[PDB]
Amino acid sequence: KIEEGKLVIWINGDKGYNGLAEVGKKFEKDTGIKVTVEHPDKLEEKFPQVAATGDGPDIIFWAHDRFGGYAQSGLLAEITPDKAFQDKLYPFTWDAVRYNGKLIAYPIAVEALSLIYNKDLLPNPPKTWEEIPALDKELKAKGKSALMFNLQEPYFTWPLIAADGGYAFKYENGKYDIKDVGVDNAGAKAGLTFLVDLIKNKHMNADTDYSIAEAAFNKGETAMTINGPWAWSNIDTSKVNYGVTVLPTFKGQPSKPFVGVLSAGINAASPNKELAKEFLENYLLTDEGLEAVNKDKPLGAVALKSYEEELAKDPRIAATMENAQKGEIMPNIPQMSAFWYAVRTAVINAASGRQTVDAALAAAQTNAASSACGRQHLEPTGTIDMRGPGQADCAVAIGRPLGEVVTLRVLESSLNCSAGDMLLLWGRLTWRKMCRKLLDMTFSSKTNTLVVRQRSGRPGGGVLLRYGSQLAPETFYRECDMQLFGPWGEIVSPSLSPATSNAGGCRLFINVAPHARIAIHALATNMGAGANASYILIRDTHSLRTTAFHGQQVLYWESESSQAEMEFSEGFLKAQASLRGQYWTLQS
Ligand SMILES: *[C@H]1O[C@H](CO)[C@@H](O[C@@H]2O[C@H](CO)[C@@H](O)[C@H](O)[C@H]2NC(C)=O)[C@H](O)[C@H]1NC(C)=O
Numbered sequence: 151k152i153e154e155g156k157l158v159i160w161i162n163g164d165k166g167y168n169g170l171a172e173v174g175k176k177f178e179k180d181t182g183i184k185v186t187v188e189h190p191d192k193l194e195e196k197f198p199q200v201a202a203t204g205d206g207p208d209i210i211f212w213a214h215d216r217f218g219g220y221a222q223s224g225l226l227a228e229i230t231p232d233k234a235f236q237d238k239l240y241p242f243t244w245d246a247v248r249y250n251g252k253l254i255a256y257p258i259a260v261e262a263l264s265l266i267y268n269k270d271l272l273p274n275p276p277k278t279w280e281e282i283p284a285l286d287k288e289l290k291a292k293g294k295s296a297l298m299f300n301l302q303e304p305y306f307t308w309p310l311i312a313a314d315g316g317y318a319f320k321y322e323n324g325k326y327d328i329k330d331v332g333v334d335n336a337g338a339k340a341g342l343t344f345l346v347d348l349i350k351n352k353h354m355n356a357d358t359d360y361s362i363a364e365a366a367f368n369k370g371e372t373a374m375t376i377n378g379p380w381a382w383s384n385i386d387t388s389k390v391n392y393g394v395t396v397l398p399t400f401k402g403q404p405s406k407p408f409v410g411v412l413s414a415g416i417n418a419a420s421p422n423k424e425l426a427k428e429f430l431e432n433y434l435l436t437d438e439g440l441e442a443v444n445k446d447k448p449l450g451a452v453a454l455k456s457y458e459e460e461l462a463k464d465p466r467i468a469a470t471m472e473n474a475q476k477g478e479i480m481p482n483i484p485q486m487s488a489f490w491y492a493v494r495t496a497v498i499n500a501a502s503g504r505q506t507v508d509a510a511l512a513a514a515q516t517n518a519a520s521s522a523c524g525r526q527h528l529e530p531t532g533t534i535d536m537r538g539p540g541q542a543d544c545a546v547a548i549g550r551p552l553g554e555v556v557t558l559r560v561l562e563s564s565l566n567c568s569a570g571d572m573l574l575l576w577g578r579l580t581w582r583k584m585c586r587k588l589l590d591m592t593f594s595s596k597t598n599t600l601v602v603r604q605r606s607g608r609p610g611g612g613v614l615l616r617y618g619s620q621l622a623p624e625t626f627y628r629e630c631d632m633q634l635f636g637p638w639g640e641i642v643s644p645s646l647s648p649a650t651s652n653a654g655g656c657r658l659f660i661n662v663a664p665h666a667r668i669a670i671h672a673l674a675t676n677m678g679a680g681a682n683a684s685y686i687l688i689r690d691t692h693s694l695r696t697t698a699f700h701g702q703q704v705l706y707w708e709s710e711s712s713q714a715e716m717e718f719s720e721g722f723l724k725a726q727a728s729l730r731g732q733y734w735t736l737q738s
């Protein structure tokens with residue numbers, strides 16, 4: 151699907167592709183072979199699907215974090231340089247591109263977020279994070295902002311969360327303990343509580359972007375931004391007289407920015423292996439080579455010992471290297487993907503004040519754990535990557551409270567459609583089944599629950615989709631109806647006043663994770679002394695078998711579904727009876 155005697159490359163748009171392409175053109179002249187350099191959007195999420203097919207580029211450039219999943223996926227080919235070549239590079243960088251004791255990617259440069267500040271507006275920058283909100287006011291006065299950086303990507307926000315506490319995948323016994331990540335630790339929660347403070351206290355817009363912030367700082371609208379070596383190239387062309395210093399310090403600790411190693415991976419399917427090795431070792435990883443690239447957009451600390459000794463002189467590096475030291479290297483594994491999406495949501499959901507910092511991180515912590523076919527729920531946003539799951543029968547449930555509805559957008563699709571692969575959005579009052587053109591089309595529940603089966607036999611054939619919630623466009627649940635739907639929990643009869651709306655008894659929806667049944671133990675009182683009147687009925691939402699409870703005391707009942715609801719009789723409410731108990735799950 152890729153063709154021979156020619157190299158294709160996917161670098162990130164926010165890096166020097168013009169400079170690289172220049173190296174490709176000198177390579178094209180001396181070698182005599184074509185070099186094409188694309189920079190497609192979302193290439194981090196897209197290269198997998200496209201190389202997984204056997205197509206994609208001959209080379210790919212990305213920070214070493216994603217490369218472990220790519221290696222695990224079988225997409226990457228084993229790079230095997232001579233001791234003579236390996237000795238020209240900081241062996242620390244080789245240690246970032248080594249999966250299962252195999253090198254999978256050529257290391258190019260070490261990046262890390264520094265603090266960039268306008269020397270003009272700000273002569274001395276802040277030492278602490280804590281002294282910015284004061285500094286914002288002191289710049290609101292002058293009609294300005296102290297700090298603007300991308301709050302969408304987590305890479306940027308992470309340093310402040312990880313300053314005090316906050317880790318991702320512990321290093322225990324010289325390995326990453328995937329069952330033990332920091333995310334929901336008081337250090338992280340306090341670190342994220344502070345970011346939320348600044349948005350709350352109107353110092354940072356809850357939705358700044360990279361372009362927004364890159365332009366706001368470059369114009370001089372804002373005093374500080376947070377960015378890596380690639381960013382300077384455009385700030386330079388704004389004559390801002392900008393500084394690059396150490397990140398400010400949270401709760402006494404310094405900020406801990408993740409360290410990226412830009413690494414150039416070679417595609418499993420590439421019939422041009424020999425050339426890629428020839429291009430990167432002989433041509434790109436050379437002082438003459440790396441200069442060209444650093445020029446268009448600065449690389450920062452380079453893998454090449456020879457050429458890194460020079461940049462070390464410029465203090466923009468030194469600031470970065472000093473920031474690199476305070477922070478930790480990026481885990482070079484697959485579960486990074488799970489980790490990333492989990493945090494991005496945790497930021498967004500809680501930065502959009504639709505999630506408590508605790509609630510957001512706790513959800514994010516559990517999200518970086520096992521398989522994707524569990525249950526999502528009580529998350530404004532969410533990114534379910536059901537691609538290449540263990541069962542190709544990946545069912546997953548979403549749950550917001552009453553008064554809300556669920557949005558859903560498919561982001562990537564690698565389903566067979568024809569064999570029988572398809573999606574399925576079963577709802578209370580919704581139902582949709584699809585394949586074919588499901589890409590980039592918005593779907594909607596009409597209610598607070600939603601569940602999404604994925605029938606696809608292709609081992610790595612699954613879909614990646616993002617979801618959200620929205621305010622009830624109409625609303626029609628009569629308030630008193632409550633919604634409790636967790637792994638397990640408490641049960642209380644609701645009540646209402648003698649007048650209000652007597653017609654229609656309240657219900658109680660409890661929807662749980664799929665392929666799990668809900669169990670109800672509960673005891674009810676105040677019923678008092680044909681079957682009379684005033685009772686409680688219970689059934690699964692999509693079943694007609696309703697077991698009622700007439701003049702009862704203690705009651706036990708099991709679902710045969712994730713979805714369930716029990717209804718309280720208009721009689722039972724008018725007669726003022728009450729019920730309490732617990733509910734649980736996990737039984738298939
Ligand atoms: C789903 O459709 C794909 C189309 O690619 C089918 O793959 C084909 O398999 C048959 C072998 O019986 C041949 O037509 C080719 O090997 C494949 N297609 C092409 C164009 O090469 C696949 O078989 C279908 N799923 C099922 C259930 O068979």
Ligand SMILES: OC[C@H]1O[C@H](O[C@H]2[C@H](O)[C@@H](O)[C@@H](O)O[C@@H]2CO)[C@H](O)[C@@H](O)[C@@H]1O
Binds near residue numbers: 216412
């Ligand atoms: O989710 C955060 C994101 O962080 C990194 O992306 C960085 C990247 O390291 C830099 O090389 C450059 O591309 O800027 C990005 C931030 O927008 C990880 O490489 C990536 O996997 C991760 O998703």
